[PDB]
Amino acid sequence: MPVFHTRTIESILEPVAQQISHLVIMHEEGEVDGKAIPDLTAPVAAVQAAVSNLVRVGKETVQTTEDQILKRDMPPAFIKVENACTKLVQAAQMLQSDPYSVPARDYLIDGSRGILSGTSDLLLTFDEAEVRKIIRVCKGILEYLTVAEVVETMEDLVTYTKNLGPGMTKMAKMIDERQQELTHQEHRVMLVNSMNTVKELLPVLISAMKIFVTTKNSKNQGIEEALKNRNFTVEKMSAEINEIIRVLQLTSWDEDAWASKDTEAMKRALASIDSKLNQAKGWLRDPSASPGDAGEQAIRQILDEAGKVGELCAGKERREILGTCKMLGQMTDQVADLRARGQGSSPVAMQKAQQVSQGLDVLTAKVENAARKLEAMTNSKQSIAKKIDAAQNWLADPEGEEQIRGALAEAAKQVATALQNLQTKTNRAVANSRPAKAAVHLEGKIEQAQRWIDNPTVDDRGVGQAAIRGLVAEGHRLANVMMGPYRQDLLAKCDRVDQLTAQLADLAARGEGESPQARALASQLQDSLKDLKARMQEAMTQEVSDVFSDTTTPIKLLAVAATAPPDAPNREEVFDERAANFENHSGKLGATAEKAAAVGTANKSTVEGIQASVKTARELTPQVVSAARILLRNPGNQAAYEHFETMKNQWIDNVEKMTGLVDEAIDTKSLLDASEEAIKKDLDKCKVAMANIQPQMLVAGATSIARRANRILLVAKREVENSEDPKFREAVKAASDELSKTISPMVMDAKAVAGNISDPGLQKSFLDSGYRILGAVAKVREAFEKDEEFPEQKANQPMMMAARQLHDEARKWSSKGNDIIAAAKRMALLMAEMSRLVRGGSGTKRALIQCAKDIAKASDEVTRLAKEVAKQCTKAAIATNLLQVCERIPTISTQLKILSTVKATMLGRTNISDEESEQATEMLVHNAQNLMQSVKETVREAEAASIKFTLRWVRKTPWYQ
Ligand SMILES: [Ca+2]
């Protein structure tokens, strides 16, 4: 099994597999055509030289290495390489006498496959031991984080610190280089993110240890919260280091990453369900609470936490959570409706809601069954495969209950091969046990839903249905905040899409699927999705413009409620309230940011970033509250002040970058319409505030207006650092500068009217300044041959389904006139050929290798011209994003060439294929999908970068809506 996770392996294994492609090409020229095989002497000598380098440095390594694992795993590579090497040399010797020798060609096709396998295994052992070093350092730091609790003296604090130094420095350097030596870009992203999180967590660590030790040397009263924050820091840092250790051992795409994410989100739904369980169960059972209240929604969103669990369990276990969720949802609806009319406390208002909520305690129990279930499934999954199967697979050459412990929790060297077979079987069952998941960014969800609604191939891609369900769930989440327009976007559109999709499902499983009765209804559902996208982005924009207007005043009031004088009144009466409003504000911001990441127009990178910052703030709120409680506890103490300032600054910066990333995910002109609407509404509350003599309300509204104007100044300065032309830098700046001109006059005029609230001239001055701000924001807004067909042939196909998904996606646009759609069409066609060639095996070797070479060539065309597109385009975000989709193309093309050469050395269906040939088909399929859809995203985003010269993206199909 070949590997490609580093640039050194690739730089070594690409020319090797290339010369091997030559040798198997001449092998086919010999075996299929009976042609003279020429002087293999020079090429075999070059191969055996470039490989004898690896063998030589390896043999020198095993002498001077203290690594025992290397001493075990390295000589077998020496044998697997030397054998095939000498075998190829022998083939070169025999084919000098008789260039038609039938056993000399047996030794030519066995050695090339053997030199590929052996070379890959040898490099894999090197790499493996190189990482084992890095993991040795990481485990060093992990063990050093456990001795953090023994520090009780400032002497122990400084000593602990200075000794922690060198290991941290060495780890950071090692990871910074290893990530630069990796080919899988996502792995690099994970290493960078984790190491950055640890490095950003060190100062918080020494701060928490500092307040712990100052609180310990003296007899201060903040000892508990201090150890809470310190133990939390050890927890988070140790967890991130463990993430580093897991990623470092990855040699392919993420295979078991879904497990940990699914189980941690699974537990997150419950850790979040606890609090709202208590609160909502406590203050709903009251005889009335006006609907739309935050305490009312406190149940309506609880069920949402169950839904995200129901979307994680497989399609069958969805039963309990889905049916219970629907019944609880409709019975609470009746609670709100009945309680908000002339009749409350008719037993239907008590006896129904009571049995229901007593059932809320039941669906809160059903979700833990699936949560415990799945985990035991992941802990058993990794415990069997990793801890016993590998460890005693190595030690096959005694003691027993390792293979017993693996064999019990599941349900010579060929016996271990059977162990690998059954392991793959268990991984198959585990993989099926979980349902397919829709994308997270919007266009992925609506694209999968789109691919299911128009041609529902019966009983596959429940990913489209899952995308519709995730979109409808996100529409329910966006709706709970509204009031009047609450019913029109929720009831009509969300339930209309749920109903319509239920019609296209019941109308496809129990009946016919291709009739126009299901295709005339499909357009009824295809545009409804567009409606939910439009109004969902609209309501999301309105919600963001309100919730994210002020992100810092609650924690500011909490900061001044902590430094209150000791003789101040109601110190905890106001403090606990500031912490309550601070936790509520933080959670509200987090939820709004989640909706923004789900519905907004932003690439998956910024979606993962928004979710990451929401995770971080959600983790940071309680420790900020506890820091406020160790400052409020000890007045005049400098250490508590430094700690609370550190924590509060952490929260401030995380919510700041959260505000920015969330702002990226919104159509900025729609945002300007939203904030302009908010300035219109704010001024009405000002006229009213004057009419009823409310100067505090007036200055509050004016400060809100100036706040929004400054925010618009931020989003306007953002468009300056994004455009590379003063076409935008005098239009945007020429308006934002005047918007900055209009700010302060409105403020001082507001302060003027606040003292004489009924003076018509003063009021007139203030209002004039305000509407001048309004017009300024308005100006800021105003500143903004022929073709081929797919060779589908009648009856492997999973490799062709990707080729179809690219061909059907490339043909949507221009035939020619742009080399990228020509090259992508040709790539999907050549992939339709390669799918036919993989299960071939009769003169298909040269056609398959030549096919991979063609795919790599067209890939170079796409990458080249797309890189040309990126540098003649405004807004650097689209350019850099396009480059991000472009860099993952040449790597996957090269890996496609090498894998193709392996499959070619095993393509003459001469038998060495217990499952070894089945592996190379699967790797070619995985690589084929990743390449395929990678150039698909490169095509779509390539057109996005062409709306900004260069290409012509005119569409093919004639306009018919
Ligand atoms: Ca003035």
Numbering used by the authors: 1 to 397, 402 to 415, 463 to 835, 880 to 890, 895 to 1047, 1054 to 1066
Q: What did the article's authors report about this structure?
A:
Vinculin is composed of a N-terminal globular head domain, which consists of 4 α-helical bundles (D1-D4), that are connected to a C-terminal tail via a flexible hinge. The structures show that all vinculin variants consist of five helix-bundle domains four of which (D1-D4) form the vinculin head (Vh) that is connected through a long, partially unresolved, linker (“hinge”) to the fifth helical bundle (tail domain; Vt). In the closed conformer, Vt appears as a rod whose two ends bind to head domains D1 and D4, via residues conserved in vinculin and metavinculin; a small additional contact is made with D3.
In addition to comparing the energy required to open vinculin to that of vinculin-T12, we have created a novel variant of T12 termed T12-A974K, which contains an additional positive charge that might further destabilize head-to-tail interactions, leading to facilitated activation. Surprisingly, comparison of the new T12-A974K structure with the published structure of WT vinculin and of mVin indicated that despite the loss of 4 hydrogen bonds and the weakening of the remaining ones, the crystal structure clearly displayed a closed conformation. The T12 and T12-A974K mutation sites (residues D974, K975, R976 and R978) map to the Vt-D4 interface and hit hydrogen bonds that stabilize this interface (T974-N773, K975-E772 and R978-E775). The loss of these hydrogen bonds also leads to lengthening of hydrogen bonds between back-bone atoms in T12-A974K. Anchor residues N773 and E775 form hydrogen bonds to the side chains of D974 and R978, respectively; mutation of these residues to alanine would significantly weaken the Vt-D4 interactions in vinculin-T12 and vinculin-T12-A974K compared to native vinculin. In T12-A974K the additional positive charge augments the positive potential on the Vt side of the Vt-D4 interface. The structure, however, shows that K974 does not form a hydrogen bond with D4; rather, hydrophobic contacts between the CH2 groups of K974 and the side chain of N773 are observed. The number of contacts involving K974 exceeds the number of contacts that A974 can make and together with the augmented positive potential it is possible that the Vt-D4 contact in vinculin-T12-A974K is stronger than in vinculin-T12. Interestingly, the C state of vinculin-T12-A974K persists longer than that of the T12 variant, but the SO state, detected at low voltage just like in T12, is considerably less stable, and occurs for only a narrow range of collision voltages, before the next transition to the O state takes place. Another interesting observation is that T12 expression in cells converts FAs to force independent, while T12-A974K exerts a nearly opposite effect - namely its destabilization of FA in Y27632 cells.
